[PDB]
A and B are shown apart, each in its own frame.
Chain A
């Protein structure tokens, strides 16, 4: 009676644990991957991250400048 009215079967807890373990394992591997990706982008600068501004080339004036040699 106690088992019937207060508790559930073992399969429920077993499969809930399986799902929880999957979630945590993927989170751990994602954390490692993100750390490595951040390190690579900060070192190489070719990624979307750690992009530091440079001078906009639309500011340059391309006209004759009173002297032939610029």
Chain B
């Protein structure tokens, strides 16, 4: 406790650049695993259409697959508009 605080205070003197760099690097390592918006970034990346959406040949056994883009079923992007 006392030794660690003394070491950190001694480093903050005559070595502030190293203290700042190590703090910033540790924050970069730690914070993404705790932020709630990383999953939002993953969802945004998965929502970017780079390829043509190839239609499925319908067999009468897909209630969840829409027939038209206007149909209610299918993934929605309202959350992205909200952000």
Contact = CB atoms under 8 A, between A and B. Distances in A.
Contacts of A66: 51-52
B13 interface: no
Chain B contact-residue range equals: under 10
Contacts, number: 4
- Is the contact region of chain B dominated by helix, strand, or loop, or is it mixed? loop
A15 B52 CA distance: 85
A66 B50 CA distance: 9
Contacts of B51: 64, 66
- Which of under 10, 10 to 19, 20 to 34, or 35 or more describes the interface residues of A? under 10
Interface string A48-70: 00000000000000001010000
B54 interface: yes
A66 B54 CA distance: 9
Contacts of A64: 51, 54
Interface in B32-55: 51-52, 54
Nearest to A65: B51
A46 B68 CA distance: 54
Interface in B47-72: 51-52, 54
4 contacts: A64-B51, A64-B54, A66-B51, A66-B52
Interface of A: 64, 66
Interface of B: 51-52, 54
